Structures are given as C-alpha cells and as structure tokens.
C-alpha cells in the first residue's frame, strides 16, 4: 500500500500516510413512533349490509394512517385489481385523500367497474374516471346478501337520459321518458320507473350471485399528508455504530446513553457545527447521543526496502482498544514495534515525543532524547580559560532562483 500511494518500488526510510481506517456498520435500524390511531377499513369491508348501486356510499377516513392489510377480509378475492398503482407498493405511499366507495353488484357486472367500461352499471349507476388511480376489490356475498325468498332490497338504475360522469351520484327516481310525451309523471306505457330490483337468491348461479364491491380511490392534492403510516422497526443496539433512521433523521454512528435533559416537546439535537449529536427515541422517551463512528488515519512507518521489509502500522488519533506489540501513545497507537525504555536519537518522528527506528531486528519505539547531559560547576571564584583553537568549516546551502515556466 505504501508503494501504491507513493507510486514507486523502492520506498525510503520514514513514515508515510497511505489510507484511512473506517469501521463499517454491522446492522441498520429504523425507529419511527408507535402505530397509533389505526384507520377503520373493516367498517367498510366488514359492514353488516352494503348500500345499493344507485346510492353507493362514499367514506372519507382522514388523519387515520393507511395500513393496507385487506387480505384478512376473505382472502380468496374474486377480483383484486389495481389501477395506477401496484398491489403491494401501495402500502408504503402517501396520499391526500383515500376516498372509499362501496356497493353491491352481480358477479358478471364486476367487469363494468373498471376504467373505460360500457354497460348498465358503468354508465347509469357508477362511473370511474379514465385515469383512475386506485384499487377495486370485489368478493362474493351470496350467504349474506341472499335469501331463500329473494333479497329485493338492492336496487339499480336501468334507464337514464344520459351517461353519468366519473364518480357521479344520482338518487333521482323520476319516471324515465321513453316515448314522446312527458307522461305527467305516471308509470305507464313508454314511461318506466328507472330503478329495478335484484332479488338475489341462494340458488342463483355464480354469474348472478351478489358481489360486494369496494373501491379505494387515492387523491394526492395541495394540502398536508396525514395517512400512510404502517412504518415499523428494530430494537436499539447500543455501543456499536449502526445506520439509524430515526423519524427521518438518517445517519451512521453510535447511539450512547445521555445525561442531558431535553424539553418534553423537543426531539432532535444539533451541535455548534450543525452536527446531530442527540436524538429522542420515538418508541420510548429517551435521548441517545450520536457519537461519530470510530475513524482516523493508518500510516506505514517503514525503515526502507534497502535494509528490510518489516514495517509498523500506526493508527493516528484513535484509541485501539477495539479494532505485533500493541502500544497506546498520545498521538495514536502503533502495532509492530516494541516500546524500548532507553532514549536514543530520533530518526522517524511519530508524534508526542515518540520515534521509531531499526535497532539491528525489528522496529523499535522510544522517547526522543533532546541531547546529551552536562552540568558545569558554577563557582564565584572559578573560570574555564581555553588553551587551543580549532578551525572548522560550516556548510550552509540556500536556494536562490526557481525554474521560469509559462503556460
């Protein structure tokens, strides 16, 4: 790695920084608050009796989450189709309005409940928009909505002046004028009543048996977003930098125990350098400090490929109690060298007064010596007078000019 970072093959004697030591996260938690005011979908899927088609009901559930677990309502669905959205990705998307419409129709009439359909129901009773974004759930209800004598409580429109608009509701029971005269509002020849009955019986065929249908219309408009919360996750893992996703605040680090008392309505926390150092757990009210995941710099202290190849590995600015003689210094910690207790001359500096060299054998580590020791005898009646002279030479090299370049 030293030869790679230096782009050479014969590295000299000294210390060289090559890479950086970074601990990778092991797991990854989400923690977002408890799942609370659940919507009531069973109130429309598990209703004692559904409404007619000409008077189909429309329920708006609001600020009520959106847990799409419709499977438990008679899982063997006869028709579970989705328009504009896929089946399961539905459960993890937000929307403004979650309008839910319900009504009862025949088994062979369920095909009319879909975008771009023609017939009696689709045109005169219930019309869906062309670009409808939602789901259509239909299930058999023979046992519930059928009697041996015929259930004539469900009515449907058979005649109308024009086709209904998307999501249009018409309760009008006026006599449909099929002839030329208005009939003065009386049922007779060429003047038929618009609504007709069903008369579901248990002996009817699958095509004529009653089918309870419900539509999930999803609107997303300029307003807030208060539904879609089936969000849930793992337990707190303390003392081990993981990936946390606390209530949208995402990061990587260690969540340690705190002693700073926050405000009751306060959840997040930042330092002076705009760094998240504390977050409140949504499940249980408790503050956890985000400490940065252990990091520093790895450096090779090589004596040079000329002598040998035994090198030492120094992690700077990190205590190596976590992830070859281990020794902790004040500038880091080095592995591969032995702490020798006799001070010699510094050759390869490390930091905080520690130097390394080759004893000749293995890399050593010692406190650098500032020089020799000499204590002169200071007396008020003694002096040191020189006798001989020495003519020495001192070499001082100094640069003057540079290389004149142009671009």
């Amino acid at each position: 790695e030293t030869k790679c970072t230096l782009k050479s093959f014969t590295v000299e004697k000294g210390i060289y920084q090559t890479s950086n030591f970074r601990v990778q996260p092991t797991e990854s938690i989400v923690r977002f608050p408890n799942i609370t005011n659940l919507c009531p979908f069973d109130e429309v899927f598990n209703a004692t009796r559904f409404a007619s088609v000409y008077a189909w009901n429309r329920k708006r559930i609001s600020n009520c989450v959106a847990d799409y677990s419709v499977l438990y309502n008679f899982a063997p669905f006869f028709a579970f189709k989705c328009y504009g959205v896929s089946p399961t990705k539905l459960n993890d998307l937000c929307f403004t309005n979650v309008y839910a419409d319900s009504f009862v129709i025949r088994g062979n009439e369920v095909s009319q409940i879909a975008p771009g359909q023609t017939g009696n129901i689709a045109d005169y009773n219930y019309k869906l928009p062309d670009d409808f974004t939602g789901c259509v759930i239909a299930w058999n209800s023979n046992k519930l909505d059928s009697k041996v004598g015929g259930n004539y409580n469900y009515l449907y429109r058979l005649f109308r002046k024009s086709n209904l608009k998307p999501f249009e509701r018409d309760i009008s029971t006026e006599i449909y004028q099929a002839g030329n005269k208005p009939c003065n509002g009386v049922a007779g020849f060429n003047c038929y009543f618009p609504l007709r009955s069903y008369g579901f019986r248990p002996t009817y065929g699958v095509g004529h048996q009653p089918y309870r249908v419900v539509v999930l219309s999803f609107e997303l408009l300029h307003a807030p977003a208060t539904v879609c919360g089936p969000k849930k996750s793992t337990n707190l893992v303390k003392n081990k930098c993981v990936n946390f996703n606390f209530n949208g605040l995402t990061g990587t680090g260690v969540l340690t125990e705190s002693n700073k008392k926050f405000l009751p309505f306060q959840q997040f926390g930042r330092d002076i350098a705009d760094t998240t150092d504390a977050v409140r757990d949504p499940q249980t009210l408790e503050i956890l400090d985000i400490t940065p995941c252990s990091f520093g710099g790895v450096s090779v202290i090589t004596p040079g490929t000329n002598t040998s190849n035994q090198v030492a590995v120094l992690y700077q600015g990190v205590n190596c109690t976590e992830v070859s003689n281990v020794f902790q210094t004040r500038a880091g910690c080095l592995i591969g060298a032995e702490y020798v207790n006799n001070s010699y001359e510094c050759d390869i500096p490390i930091g905080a007064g520690i130097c390394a060299s080759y004893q000749t054998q293995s890399i050593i580590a010692y406190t650098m010596s500032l020089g020799a020791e000499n204590s002169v005898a200071y007396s008020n009646n003694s002096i040191a007078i020189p006798t001989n002279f020495t003519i020495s030479v001192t070499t001082e090299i100094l640069p003057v000019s540079m290389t004149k370049t142009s671009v």
């Binding site: 950086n20 990587t252 700077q316 020791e373 200071y378 007396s379």
Partner: protein
C-alpha cells in the same frame, strides 16, 4: 480527507470523485507538507543547543533572583512560574477533519528552554559558540556592560543596586503581563484563525450548492441515480471549491507562520545566545541579555535593557 469530506459514505460518489482528477492526492499532499513544515519551525529556535544544561543546586548567582524563570520542582510539569502563567492564558474527531498533534510536546520544549536558560545564565554566550565555559554571573554582567561601552567599574561597585533593580523588574513583569489580558494576542489570534478555518468548512457542507438537498442519502433516495448524476456532480464541485480555497488559505498562513518562526529563531540566536549590537532587535534600548520562555504556540523573550536616566547638563569641547 478528500474522500470523506466531499463524499459522505457513498460508493457511487467515490467512483464519481476519481473522474475529477488528481486533486484528492494533491490537497492531502500540500496539507502534509504544511504539517512537516510546522514540525520543523519548532526545532530551529528551541533545538539550537546540542547538550542539555542544568542549573546548579546552590541558588546563589551573585545577588540576582531567577526563581521566576527557572523550572519549579514542586509542580510535576517542570516549568517556571512565568511559563505557568503564560500556559494558563492561551485558550485552546468530528468529520474527515483531524488535528495532528505536534512532535515536541509542551514538556520537551520546556526542557529545551530550561537548558537554554542554564546555558545563558551559567556559561553566558559560550554555550552557543562551542564548548560551555563556567563563569560567574557578575563577571558575565560586567562582560555585557563592557560590550556596549559602559565600563565594568559601575557594575563592580554598584552591584547591589543593579541586582535590586533586576529583581524588582522580574517581580513587576508578572504583574505587567497579568494586567493586560490582551498581552498574548499574537498567540491567540493564530489559534482563533485556525479554529475559524476549521469550523467554517463544516458550516458550508449544509449548503445545497444548487442541488435540492445537502445530504447524499436524500438525493440517492428521492431521485434515481441515472437522473441524479448532475446533482452529485454539482455537489462535488461545490465541496471541492470550498476545500481548494481552504488549502490555499492554509498555505498562506503556513508561509506567514514560517516567516514568523524564522524571525523568532534569528532573535533567539542573536539575543539569547549572545549579545547583539542592534538597536531594537533585542529590545528597545541597550540590550544586555535575553531569557526565553515557552508557550503553547510561541515563545516569549524577556530582554534585559540598560537605560540611562537622570542626565545632567555639562559643557563640552
């Protein structure tokens, strides 16, 4: 860290960063040169002596008092009361920005300062030009007085007065340094500038630099990678332009610090390790001697100055 500062824990950002060029191996090559240069400025002024000298046990130099400049054996950290007062006035791993500690700690610099003090007190100026020669301190003061033109008799006769004046000056220098809290302004300004330059880089990371957000985990989760490449490119450009100017300012400040350290080493060599004939290079007035004192990020020179006073009118021919 060129990789972590620009690209937070993102492998695609790391793959995109290598296409910009060799800036990642140059911005870290210049900063390590700055560090190795800073590890040399603290050796041209404090490590001028070869052998460490020590103070004799008898604390009688001839009448003078050097207790405030000599190390105190009571305090575990071997320093002087002046150095202890100076150390208690300089007010000093978050993201890919680390602070490397210096090689020579505050204990070895103190030992070098004590050795220089012992050499300039017991030996005089010979400890900086060859073998150390023992000489009484009053005779060294007579030497330094004759070097500027004043005869040695005024010192050999009025020795008690000079000693009392020097002791009073040494005692009053502590109150003078403690009176003005902005006396160590040159040592706090550099620390404040370094802290500001180190804290302004994290404050600019929150800026979107043109993108929709500032964190990579949001851009890599709201938009698809095939259409989110220009946002990461703009973010990398903005985070590299903020680091290039930081490295440039660091180089300018390192050159300034190197010039200041060269000047300080010249002053230490020409004022502490001997007497100079310059006017205001070793203090305002007639320079006699200089005592060094260490400080967490600098050196304080105490220059002893002989000033004439109580002049009188006379006739000259």
């Amino acid at each position: 860290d060129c990789t972590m500062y620009i690209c937070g824990d993102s492998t695609e950002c790391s793959n995109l960063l290598l296409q910009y060029g060799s800036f990642c191996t140059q911005l870290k090559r210049a900063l390590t040169g700055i560090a190795v240069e800073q590890d040399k400025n603290t050796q041209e002024v404090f490590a001028q002596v070869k052998q460490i000298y020590k103070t004799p046990p008898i604390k009688y130099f001839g009448g003078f008092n050097f207790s405030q400049i000599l190390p105190d054996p009571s305090k575990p950290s071997k320093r002087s009361p002046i150095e202890d007062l100076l150390f208690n006035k300089v007010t000093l791993k978050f993201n890919g920005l680390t602070v490397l500690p210096p090689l020579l700690t505050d204990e070895m610099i103190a030992q070098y300062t004590s050795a220089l003090l012992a050499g300039t007190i017991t030996s005089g100026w010979t400890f900086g030009a060859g073998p150390a020669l023992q000489i009484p301190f009053p005779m060294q003061m007579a030497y330094r007085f004759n070097g500027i033109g004043v005869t040695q008799n005024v010192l050999y006769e009025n020795q008690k007065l000079i000693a009392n004046q020097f002791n009073s000056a040494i005692g009053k220098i502590q109150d003078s340094l403690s009176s003005t809290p902005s006396a160590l302004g040159k040592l706090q300004d550099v620390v404040n500038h370094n802290a500001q330059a180190l804290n302004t880089l994290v404050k600019q990371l929150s800026s979107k630099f043109g993108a929709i957000s500032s964190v990579l985990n949001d851009i890599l989760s709201r938009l698809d990678p095939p259409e989110a490449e220009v946002q990461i490119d703009r973010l990398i450009t903005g985070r590299l332009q903020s680091l290039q100017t930081y490295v440039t300012q660091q180089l300018i400040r390192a050159a300034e610090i190197r010039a200041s350290a060269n000047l300080a080493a010249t002053k230490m060599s020409e004022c502490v390790l001997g007497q100079s004939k310059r006017v205001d290079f070793c203090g305002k007035g007639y320079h006699l001697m200089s005592f060094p004192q260490s400080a967490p990020h600098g050196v304080v020179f105490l220059h002893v100055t002989y000033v004439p006073a109580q002049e009188k009118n006379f006739t000259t021919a």
